[PDB]
């Protein structure tokens, strides 16, 4: 795993996130599943808890975006860049954009949201690319058929751990 | 990517740089904008920032120089060996120097002061030889012509940033 104990971590144990759009690709039910599908990855393994809210500045804004979005980081089109997100701290830290130019789907027909924002919550918790191939933090997207199978890997419990330790249970 | 032994970078993200001396292959501008460019693409992709110093030692001497010049390894005419950097560190360590039994140019009619100078600063930051043939770090200077497509390749970015993590308010790239 990749952490850079300069940068800071979030200082305290409960983050917000806030939905702030929705792809035409998903039923927006889908989206909200796949979102706190990839929180609950990480609540289990650290002391983390999340709450949603509807307005306002959420510690984590959850946003679709296509090429220039209002951040200095541009998506690129189809494919390539699947989505992006910034480490913890104020403002656009701490947030989450995925590439609309992707089809975000619920299975591994496109770009699996569950997965991709797993990873994205990665980076706004303070993870970076791991080395480690069967990471979800390895800056890999497997169209991996068998979501049945993820599991998060012991090193992205590893090293979201270095950062906020164990779960208290 | 590859670093050096044991591992030796800057401890802090802001550096300084001065340009000693000058090459009579280009004007001063042209020399000063290949440098500032150079320092540019590690800046994109890195917490480091550099500031330009005009008297006194600054982190990264830049210099142009033949054969013999004041350090352990003089360098060889024309061709072959065209420019050596420093590991991070004390007086030398970070220092750039440059071949001037090369030909600098701006393009690619002789040998791209940019492209090596980019190379170099790498070295300065703390990256060796890469042994990936399309890393700014390949120990190979080449038949290239666009310099108008130049980006970091990702090997580069995973070695610069291995070494000190991404810019603060980027995402990693
Ligand atoms: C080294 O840069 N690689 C990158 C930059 C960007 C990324 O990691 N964003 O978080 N991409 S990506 O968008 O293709 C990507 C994103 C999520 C992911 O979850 C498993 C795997 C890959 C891979
Ligand atoms: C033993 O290493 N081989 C070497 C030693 C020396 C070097 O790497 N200086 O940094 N050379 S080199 O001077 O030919 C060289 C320098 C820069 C470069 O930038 C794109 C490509 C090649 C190639
Ligand atoms: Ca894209
Ligand atoms: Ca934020
Ligand atoms: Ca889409
Ligand atoms: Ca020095
Ligand atoms: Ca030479
Ligand atoms: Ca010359
Ligand atoms: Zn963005
Ligand atoms: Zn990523
Ligand atoms: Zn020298
Ligand atoms: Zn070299």
């Avoid at 209002?70 to 104020?90: K, R, S």
């Avoid at 656009?92 to 995925?98: E, L, V, Y």
């Avoid at 080395?131 to 998060?152: G, K, V």
Wanted: charged share 20%; hydrophobic share 35%; glycine share 8%.
């Amino acid at each position: 795993f990749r952490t850079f104990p300069g940068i800071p971590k979030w200082r305290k144990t409960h983050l917000t996130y806030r939905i702030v759009n929705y792809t035409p690709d998903l039923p927006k039910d889908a989206v909200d599943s796949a979102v706190e599908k990839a929180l609950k990855v990480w609540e289990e393994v650290t002391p983390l808890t999340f709450s949603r809210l509807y307005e306002g500045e959420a510690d984590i804004m959850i946003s679709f975006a296509v090429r220039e979005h209002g951040d200095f980081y541009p998506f690129d089109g189809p494919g390539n860049v699947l989505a992006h997100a910034y480490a913890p701290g104020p403002g656009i830290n701490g947030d989450a954009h995925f590439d609309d130019d992707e089809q975000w789907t619920k299975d591994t027909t496109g770009t699996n949201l569950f997965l991709v924002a797993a990873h994205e919550i990665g980076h706004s918790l303070g993870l970076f690319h791991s080395a480690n191939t069967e990471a979800l933090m390895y800056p890999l997207y497997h169209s991996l058929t068998d979501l049945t199978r993820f599991r998060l890997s012991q090193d992205d419990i590893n090293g979201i751990q270095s950062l906020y330790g164990p779960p208290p249970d």
